[PDB]
Scaffold this motif. Sequence first.
Motif, PDB file in Angstrom:
ATOM      1  N   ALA A  70     -50.735 -20.175  -0.308  1.00  0.00           N
ATOM      2  CA  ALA A  70     -49.813 -20.950   0.527  1.00  0.00           C
ATOM      3  C   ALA A  70     -48.484 -21.220  -0.169  1.00  0.00           C
ATOM      4  N   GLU A  71     -48.457 -21.160  -1.487  1.00  0.00           N
ATOM      5  CA  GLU A  71     -47.218 -21.350  -2.229  1.00  0.00           C
ATOM      6  C   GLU A  71     -46.465 -20.048  -2.484  1.00  0.00           C
ATOM      7  N   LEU A  72     -47.167 -18.910  -2.574  1.00  0.00           N
ATOM      8  CA  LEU A  72     -46.516 -17.632  -2.864  1.00  0.00           C
ATOM      9  C   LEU A  72     -45.915 -16.974  -1.637  1.00  0.00           C
ATOM     10  N   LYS A  73     -46.497 -17.187  -0.452  1.00  0.00           N
ATOM     11  CA  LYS A  73     -45.928 -16.565   0.740  1.00  0.00           C
ATOM     12  C   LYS A  73     -44.466 -16.942   0.915  1.00  0.00           C
ATOM     13  N   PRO A  74     -44.093 -18.224   0.969  1.00  0.00           N
ATOM     14  CA  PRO A  74     -42.668 -18.530   1.125  1.00  0.00           C
ATOM     15  C   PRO A  74     -41.830 -18.083  -0.051  1.00  0.00           C
ATOM     16  N   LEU A  75     -42.375 -18.126  -1.270  1.00  0.00           N
ATOM     17  CA  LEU A  75     -41.614 -17.646  -2.421  1.00  0.00           C
ATOM     18  C   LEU A  75     -41.364 -16.135  -2.346  1.00  0.00           C
ATOM     19  N   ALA A  76     -42.383 -15.359  -1.962  1.00  0.00           N
ATOM     20  CA  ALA A  76     -42.179 -13.933  -1.718  1.00  0.00           C
ATOM     21  C   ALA A  76     -41.119 -13.698  -0.649  1.00  0.00           C
ATOM     22  N   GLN A  77     -41.135 -14.483   0.431  1.00  0.00           N
ATOM     23  CA  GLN A  77     -40.113 -14.312   1.462  1.00  0.00           C
ATOM     24  C   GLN A  77     -38.720 -14.604   0.919  1.00  0.00           C
ATOM     25  N   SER A  78     -38.584 -15.667   0.134  1.00  0.00           N
ATOM     26  CA  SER A  78     -37.280 -16.028  -0.418  1.00  0.00           C
ATOM     27  C   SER A  78     -36.729 -14.924  -1.309  1.00  0.00           C
ATOM     28  N   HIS A  79     -37.618 -14.191  -1.949  1.00  0.00           N
ATOM     29  CA  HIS A  79     -37.239 -13.149  -2.853  1.00  0.00           C
ATOM     30  C   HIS A  79     -37.145 -11.803  -2.214  1.00  0.00           C
ATOM     31  N   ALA A  80     -37.727 -11.559  -1.081  1.00  0.00           N
ATOM     32  CA  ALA A  80     -37.885 -10.182  -0.569  1.00  0.00           C
ATOM     33  C   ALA A  80     -36.994  -9.816   0.624  1.00  0.00           C
ATOM     34  N   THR A  81     -36.150 -10.738   1.077  1.00  0.00           N
ATOM     35  CA  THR A  81     -35.354 -10.489   2.277  1.00  0.00           C
ATOM     36  C   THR A  81     -33.924 -10.100   1.918  1.00  0.00           C
TER      37      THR A  81
ATOM     38  N   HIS B  51     -32.317 -11.360  -0.756  1.00  0.00           N
ATOM     39  CA  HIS B  51     -32.256 -11.292  -2.219  1.00  0.00           C
ATOM     40  C   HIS B  51     -33.501 -10.581  -2.733  1.00  0.00           C
ATOM     41  N   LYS B  52     -33.451  -9.256  -2.814  1.00  0.00           N
ATOM     42  CA  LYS B  52     -34.624  -8.485  -3.222  1.00  0.00           C
ATOM     43  C   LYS B  52     -34.779  -8.576  -4.738  1.00  0.00           C
ATOM     44  N   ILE B  53     -35.809  -9.294  -5.185  1.00  0.00           N
ATOM     45  CA  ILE B  53     -36.047  -9.487  -6.618  1.00  0.00           C
ATOM     46  C   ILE B  53     -37.202  -8.593  -7.055  1.00  0.00           C
ATOM     47  N   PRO B  54     -36.918  -7.499  -7.755  1.00  0.00           N
ATOM     48  CA  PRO B  54     -37.987  -6.588  -8.167  1.00  0.00           C
ATOM     49  C   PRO B  54     -39.018  -7.274  -9.052  1.00  0.00           C
ATOM     50  N   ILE B  55     -40.254  -6.769  -8.976  1.00  0.00           N
ATOM     51  CA  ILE B  55     -41.308  -7.274  -9.855  1.00  0.00           C
ATOM     52  C   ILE B  55     -40.896  -7.170 -11.321  1.00  0.00           C
TER      53      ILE B  55
END
Length: 153
Positions: free
Chosen positions: A84-95, A97-101
């Motif tokens: 529940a905490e990673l889903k929004p963080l992944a969204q913040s990073h993946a739209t 502002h694409k933050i590579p692994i």
Amino acid sequence: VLSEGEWQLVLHVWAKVEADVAGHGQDILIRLFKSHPETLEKFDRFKHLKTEAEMKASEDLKKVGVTALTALGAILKKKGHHEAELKPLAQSHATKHKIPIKYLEFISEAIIHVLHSRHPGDFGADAQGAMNKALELFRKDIAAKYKELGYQG
Ligand code: HEM
């Protein structure tokens, strides 16, 4: 995933971070930008910050570091129960502002470096290994959430 003892080592050093989240965040971001300069290009509001002292004086940079360490701290406290905490963080990073692994690896290295520089007596080899496992789990699960959103990281 991690043992209870490993989580305790992670959360023990994280409590030390919380004595000064802003300063830890600044040192982590400065270390990240120095070690991996390509990462600074993701922060367009920081391009005019040329020196370490400029970066430490920027309230904007300090707030960005607190936002990131606050989110990471809440995740680590879930001891792996963090969908529940990673889903929004992944969204913040993946739209937008694409933050590579790989950039999450780079900041993980900076986190390890700064925690050891500031708390060597609370961050020896076993604690370093536990934190590395916790951050590896964070990155693996973020990567799966990226993929669900259509971003291959
Ligand atoms: C431990 C690793 C990280 C954590 C926990 C983290 C956390 C966050 C959080 C909580 C936000 C706020 C999103 C929102 O409010 O919707 C955010 C935004 C952002 N992050 Fe991260 N972040 C991390 C690493 C990185 C790295 C390594 C980069 C770039 C190299 C990065 C670039 C960004 C950008 C560009 C934004 C949005 C715009 C901005 O804040 O200027 N993040 N991050």
